[PDB]
Design a protein around this nucleic acid. Structure first.
Ligand SMILES: [K+]
Ligand SMILES: [K+]
Ligand SMILES: [K+]
Ligand SMILES: [K+]
Ligand SMILES: [K+]
Ligand SMILES: [K+]
Ligand SMILES: [K+]
Ligand SMILES: [K+]
Ligand SMILES: [K+]
Ligand SMILES: [K+]
Ligand SMILES: [Mg+2]
Ligand SMILES: [Mg+2]
Ligand SMILES: [Mg+2]
Length: 1322
RNA sequence: GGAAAUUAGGUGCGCUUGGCGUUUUAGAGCUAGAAAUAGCAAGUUAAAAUAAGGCUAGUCCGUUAUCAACUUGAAAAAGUG
DNA sequence: CAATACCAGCCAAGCGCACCTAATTTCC
DNA sequence: TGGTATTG
């Protein structure tokens, strides 16, 4: 028989259904394997496959990086100890052993328990002299006395183990001694430039304000308040913002047309400043130079809070300052709370459970939790003034190892390490020879373009070696081929030219590539004037004239420039009209002008003989990012340019790659003409063919040479784009189809209809940068937590700066419930309910008529406000374009036509691949003309088609009832998809893989299903009972016969819902290391670390369970007792268990294991017990509900309408008349629950909670009935609420009862089963 | 259906790094007590581990993808109603 | 044994390639 | 949601 397949692909489900030509779902009898008395079973061909979400590889990648870094940090300490090895032996032959075994208890230690000196009196004296490592670090930097070689190592090891970041390039030499002299010098250089209006320097404690422990924004406002007759946005105000590390805009200071934003820390500053200085004049050079000088002394003011005159260890001295002020303020807080609050002294300084100082030091209270807990206490008391001040600056009772230590650059640690090495160098000869070696251990960093230092056993590595020997931080340059590695790092990822697959694409900024883009757009421009009869192309001589006169003069060429600078002069046309380009050209010779600024030799860039060398330069500047390697590769061309040009050309760099190769655009040639593709773009007579025309024109050879130059299924899907979560459904969809084909006797279906379904940390950063760019005060006036931005109106409120944007007024946070959320494009036209199409106005009517885009008067009144929000990234350019669409004519007849086509035709590329994959598997033969025979039509639909169909014919959907809706959607997809194609065969082009009239057609396309149709024109249309194809006469829809088939299909209680059994993978257990306890549930973190002494991990993840049938020793006699039980194999144990299952189980305590009866039971293994009650294995000690509550169809659509409430009044009487359905639905739940759920207490608690709210409105009661299905849903028990009664989940921890039940093995469709009566074992 | 360019936004894969946290130990608690306890003192730091571990022994690899059952397969995938 | 209670590693930087969406121009 | 511990 003939049939079709309906498919519904989702991130966690795949619906499927088989239908016949009468739109019926066939029922069959399938063989039942196993050892039960059942030999077959009747099954309908409809169901859904359910599966856990497929995971992305990010978390696995982050963990693989953390593993590499812990291995290399250990190797750094190992490098340092190897250097210290011989000389440390002469001082203390077991010092490094005590450091290694410091974690062990004294019982397990092989050496004395005090690590540093090996005895107690020396150990106590050390901590008295150096309470923190920073005390020792500072002493070793400043003192000249010879120091103990052990203490030297401990200081150097602490700087190498925690070495600080690498975000700043170059050397750093902290020098804060001249902040005062640098500030006055800045105001001195300002006064020589602005002798008209100068600033007075005296009386300004510029050091204190600019080195204060406040924000860079706060320090700026304080300085300007000190300076009379100035402003934060004045020139000197923006200059100070620069020196402090902010990004102020100098555009308004100099009457500039573009922005002049500068930041001293960005590497573009040296060229941004030159861009600005060329705009405003060279006499302002010292002004920005002095701003740079003052910035160097206050650069690390937050990290170094001690003046660098006293010590060469400002970082350590700042940590000692933290310690001393902690000590002083701790003694004061104690004596204070002792005198004024003696009742609470126990809670603050002894209770670890509370967030006091005890929980701050010994408990789990963080610095923030400590401040929040104690701040009310300090206020109540007197004399806590300075401490409340120290608290609000986050500088009270501070530790030295804190979360905010990420500011410290590695140069700072290196400075103290270099100083220690410079002191003890004189006393220890080996520290002299290895001073650079030790410094290298701290500074060395594997470049990202090198990757893992592997030797042929890493699938991630690409590194190439010069010499086959071990790589260390000292021989890295000599052993690693950084050049070959930095090249492979890119060429392993770059695309090949699809036209010539053996060729790599050019760099996006290649000069040849931009000539191509310019000539490809230029060669299709047409111009017309008054005299000529018809618009003509530009000849070859005209295009070179335009490229030489305009494109090689200005960055971007406008038609305005084209009109007024070529035709107006060279042709003298006083009025010409241009065709093929609006406003301006898209292409541009950006690289040409870039190099022209660097070399100034315009003749050299125009000298065509330098084509190859100029391409090699752009390739080097794109291939590499290390400016040292760039210089080395540009050294072969160093003779052609002066040394200053080489210094500029080396810093300039590009990124990005094109889509075409050099050989395609300017290499291969036509046989007859001998011209390459670029040559045709320059001159093609009067045809002026472009790239697409050239490689498709049979007149020349390009089309053939491209055709001349021209993988598993699992591979093919994994290589697609899109989320790995949706990819999981694609592969399962294919596997589901393959089985259905085998079910139907290996006959292929007529049609396959497929359908595919459609944070706060990123939101808070967007708001933060958005307001800060605009400089508004709404964050200061209204501060929000990042989690609170999950409110749609409140998130919009901050995107709109707390201001209505359809009209010019402010908004109030307190009246959020009274505003409106109108969609820019009406939701009827476009199914876009994202932030890109939402808005927060006061009234939806203040938009104008909802027929179109917001009114032209609205756009004209709010145009400037929307461009401000764009430049603050608070709205996207598309959102701005849509809002401003009214000035561009708004929506048209063509615009409105394209929207409803997008509502029915799926255009997503990911959905096309699924259609391409299925079509490739089904249609494989060829006809007489070697054209593919299309046996199976693959139709693609969107959700709105079946969604409207459900809502038009009252085939309503309630997701919470059960999982049947996944399969029902697949059935309706096959029905609607096949009926639409059989009715309108002309639509196969638009629905099968491989203006006003179009709008009216698509908007009424589904009308053929109805009998009485009301149109927007007011026309009431009547259609016959049976529908047919006009040409063929074949019957398509029988409205008196085929609708009844749908309800018969949707009401079928037996549908095949299958949860995909999966072996669990991932982390072994939870990550938290628990303290020592006397339980044996803990897992050792190392082999010899018994958790009873050292603690360990809890909650291991079971990979899968195994049915174990054997004997166990019982009692002191060790008599063998037979057992049958369920053993959970953890992820950690899995490899050893599968290597030798008998020895693994025998080590667990099982003897004489029946090996042939071991059953691998992965998660979600299905069991049937009594009365069809089903359980699913959540683990070895946890069960999930295994039954689906098939609710009758009459209750489903009644639950829909009663919960949701034209003929809305007619459906209301149905709800009111059938108000008795509630006690029937409840009876349905109770009957189902008492049979399969077995939650007696939870059930009568719902029954009691139900009978309490019987006086509630029917709409309100119908909503909470939907919540009750959480009690009966498939899967894990979950807590739900009924009105205000919260009923907790009833869990199934006893897995004993499954060991005597029937194990059900299901195929992917669930049609093929193997049932095993486990009660027959043991 | 597809290509290149332009503008804007987003996802994926991979590499190189920073700072916390946690765990055990070290940092002599004192006095009065038989002792439980009571009173005071003290607290900020370090080492080491950070998936158990593996052989291929690398400054490498170890949490993604893929998996009903049976009969064959190293595996993918095939064969069976 | 079953019910009940509570628990779960986090934050941050830089670099590169590839791909998707939606709008425009020129084309196959 | 599945593990651990307490509770009962
Ligand atoms: K010992
Ligand atoms: K002022
Ligand atoms: K702690
Ligand atoms: K703490
Ligand atoms: K710490
Ligand atoms: K344009
Ligand atoms: K580059
Ligand atoms: K998983
Ligand atoms: K997996
Ligand atoms: K299965
Ligand atoms: Mg780290
Ligand atoms: Mg390790
Ligand atoms: Mg730490």
């Amino acid at each position: 028989k003939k049939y079709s397949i309906g498919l519904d692909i989702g991130t966690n489900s795949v619906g499927w259904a088989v239908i016949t030509d009468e739109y019926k779902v066939p029922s069959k009898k399938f063989k039942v394997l196993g050892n039960t008395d059942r030999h077959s079973i009747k099954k309908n061909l409809i169901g859904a496959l359910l599966f856990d979400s497929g995971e992305t590889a990010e978390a696995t990648r982050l963990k693989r990086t953390a593993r590499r870094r812990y291995t290399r940090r250990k190797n750094r300490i190992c490098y340092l100890q190897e250097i210290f090895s011989n000389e440390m032996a002469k001082v203390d032959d077991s010092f490094f052993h005590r450091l290694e075994e410091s974690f062990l208890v004294e019982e397990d230690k092989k050496h004395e328990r005090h690590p540093i000196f090996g005895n107690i009196v020396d150990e106590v004296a050390y901590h008295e002299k150096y309470p923190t490592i920073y005390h020792l670090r500072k002493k070793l930097v400043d003192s000249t006395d010879k120091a103990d070689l052990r203490l030297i190592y401990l200081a150097l090891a602490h700087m190498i183990k925690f070495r600080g970041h690498f975000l700043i390039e170059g050397d750093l030499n902290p020098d804060n001694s001249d902040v005062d002299k640098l500030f006055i010098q800045l105001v001195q250089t300002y006064n020589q430039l602005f002798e008209e209006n100068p600033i007075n320097a005296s009386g300004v404690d510029a050091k204190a304000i600019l080195s204060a422990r406040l924000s860079k924004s706060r320090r700026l406002e304080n300085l300007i308040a000190q300076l009379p007759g100035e402003k934060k946005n004045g020139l000197f105000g923006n200059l100070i913002a620069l020196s402090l590390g902010l990004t102020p805009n100098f555009k308004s200071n100099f009457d500039l047309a573009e922005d002049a934003k500068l930041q001293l820390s960005k590497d573009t500053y040296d060229d941004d400043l030159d861009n600005l200085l060329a705009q405003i004049g060279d006499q302002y050079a010292d002004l920005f130079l002095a701003a740079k000088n003052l910035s160097d002394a206050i650069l690390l003011s937050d990290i170094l809070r001690v003046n660098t005159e006293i010590t060469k260890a400002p970082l350590s001295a700042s940590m000692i300052k933290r310690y001393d002020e902690h000590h002083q303020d701790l003694t004061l807080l104690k004596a204070l709370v002792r005198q004024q609050l003696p009742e609470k002294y126990k809670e603050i300084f002894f209770d670890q459970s509370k967030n006091g100082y005890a929980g701050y030091i010994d408990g789990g209270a963080s610095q923030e939790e400590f401040y929040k807990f104690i701040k009310p206490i300090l206020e109540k008391m007197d004399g806590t003034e300075e401490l409340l001040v120290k608290l609000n600056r986050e500088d009270l009772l501070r530790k030295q190892r804190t979360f905010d230590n990420g500011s410290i650059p590695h140069q700072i640690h290196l400075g103290e390490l270099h100083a220690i090495l410079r002191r003890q160098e004189d006393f220890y000869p080996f520290l002299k020879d290895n001073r650079e070696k030790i410094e290298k251990i701290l500074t060395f960093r594997i470049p990202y373009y090198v990757g893992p230092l592997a030797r042929g056993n890493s699938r991630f590595a690409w590194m190439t070696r010069k010499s086959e020997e071990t790589i260390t931080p000292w021989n890295f340059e000599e052993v690693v081929d950084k050049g070959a590695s930095a090249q492979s790092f890119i060429e392993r990822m770059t695309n090949f030219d699809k036209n010539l697959p053996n060729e790599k694409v050019l760099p996006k900024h290649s000069l040849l590539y931009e000539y191509f883009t310019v000539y490809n757009e230029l060669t299709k421009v047409k111009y017309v004037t008054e005299g000529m009869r018809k618009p003509a192309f530009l000849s070859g001589e005209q295009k070179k004239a335009i490229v030489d006169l305009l494109f090689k003069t200005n960055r971007k060429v406008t038609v305005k420039q084209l009109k007024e600078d070529y035709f107006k002069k060279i042709e003298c046309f006083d009025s010409v009209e241009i065709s093929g380009v609006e406003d301006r050209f898209n292409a541009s010779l950006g690289t040409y002008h870039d190099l022209l600024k660097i070399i100034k030799d315009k003749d050299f860039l125009d000298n065509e003989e330098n084509e190859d060398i100029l391409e090699d330069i752009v390739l080097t500047l794109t291939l590499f990012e290390d400016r040292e390697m760039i210089e080395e590769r540009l050294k072969t061309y160093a003779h052609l340019f002066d040394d200053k040009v080489m210094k500029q050309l080396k810093r300039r760099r590009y990124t990005g790659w094109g889509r075409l190769s050099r050989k395609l655009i300017n290499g291969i040639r036509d046989k007859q003409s001998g011209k390459t593709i670029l040559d045709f773009l320059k001159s093609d007579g009067f045809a002026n063919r472009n790239f697409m025309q050239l490689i498709h024109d049979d007149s020349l050879t390009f089309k053939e040479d491209i055709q001349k130059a021209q993988d598993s299924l699992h591979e093919h899907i994994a290589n697609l784009a899109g989320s790995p979560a949706i990819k999981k459904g694609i592969l399962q969809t294919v596997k589901v189809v393959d089985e259905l084909v085998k079910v139907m006797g290996r006959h292929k279906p007529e049609n396959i209809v497929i359908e595919m379904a459609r944070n706060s940390r990123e939101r808070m950063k967007r708001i933060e940068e958005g307001i800060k760019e605009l400089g508004s005060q709404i964050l200061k006036e209204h501060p929000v937590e990042n989690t609170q931005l999950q409110n749609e109106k409140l998130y919009l409120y901050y995107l709109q700066n707390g201001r209505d944007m359809y009209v010019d007024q402010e908004l109030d946070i307190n009246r959020l419930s009274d505003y409106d959320v109108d969609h820019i494009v009406p939701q009827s036209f476009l199914k876009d309910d994202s932030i890109d199409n939402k808005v927060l106005t006061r009234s939806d009517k203040a938009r104008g008529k909802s027929d179109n885009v917001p009114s032209e008067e609205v756009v004209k009144k709010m145009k400037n406000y929307w461009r401000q929000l764009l430049n603050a990234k608070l709205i996207t350019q598309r959102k701005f374009d849509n809002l401003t669409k009214a000035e561009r004519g708004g929506l048209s007849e063509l615009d409105k036509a394209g929207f409803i086509k997008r509502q029915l035709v799926e255009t997503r590329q990911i959905t096309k691949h699924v259609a391409q994959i299925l079509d490739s598997r089904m249609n494989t033969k060829y006809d007489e003309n070697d054209k593919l025979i299309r046996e199976v039509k693959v139709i693609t639909l969107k959700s709105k088609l079946v969604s409207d169909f459900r809502k038009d014919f009252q085939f309503y959907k309630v997701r919470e009832i059960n999982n049947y809706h996944h399969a029902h959607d697949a059935y309706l997809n096959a029905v609607v998809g096949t009926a639409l194609i059989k009715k309108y065969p002309k639509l196969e082009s638009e629905f099968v893989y491989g203006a006003t009239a179009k709008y009216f057609f698509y908007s009424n396309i589904m009308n053929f299903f109805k009998t009485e149709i009301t149109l927007a024109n007011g026309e009431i249309r009547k259609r016959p009972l049976i529908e047919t194809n006009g040409e063929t006469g074949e019957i398509v829809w029988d409205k008196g016969r085929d609708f009844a088939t749908v309800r018969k299909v949707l009401s079928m209680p037996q549908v095949n819902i299958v949860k995909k059994t999966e072996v669990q993978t991932g982390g072994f257990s939870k990550e938290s290391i628990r303290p020592k306890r006397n339980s044996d549930k803990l897992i050792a973190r190392k082999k010899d670390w018994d958790p009873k002494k050292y603690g360990g991990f809890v909650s291991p993840t079971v990979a899968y369970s195994v049915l174990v049938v054997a004997k166990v020793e019982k009692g002191k006699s060790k008599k063998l007792k037979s057992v049958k039980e369920l053993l959970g194999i953890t992820i950690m144990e899995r490899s050893s268990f599968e290597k030798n299952p008998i020895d693994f189980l025998e080590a667990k305590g099982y003897k004489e294991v029946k090996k042939d009866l071991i059953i691998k039971l992965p998660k979600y293994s299905l069991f049937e017990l009594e009365n069809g009650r089903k359980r699913m294995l959540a683990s070895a000690r946890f069960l999930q509900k295994g039954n689906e509550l098939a609710l009758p169809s009459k209750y489903v659509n009644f639950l829909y309408l009663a919960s949701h409430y034209e003929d809305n009044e007619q459906k209301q009487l149905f709800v009111e008349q059938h108000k008795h359905y509630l006690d029937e639905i409840i009876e349905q739940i109770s009957e189902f629950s008492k049979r399969v759920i077995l939650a007696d207490a939870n059930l009568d608690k719902v029954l009691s909670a139900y009978n309490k709210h019987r006086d509630k409105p029917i709409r309100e009661q119908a909503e909470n009935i939907i919540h009750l299905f959480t009690l009966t849903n498939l899967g894990a028990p979950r807590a739900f609420k009924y009105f205000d009664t919260t009923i907790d989940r009833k869990v199934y921890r006893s897995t004993k009862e499954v060991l005597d039940a029937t194990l059900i093995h299901q195929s992917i469709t669930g049609l093929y089963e193997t049932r095993i009566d486990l009660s027959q074992l043991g």
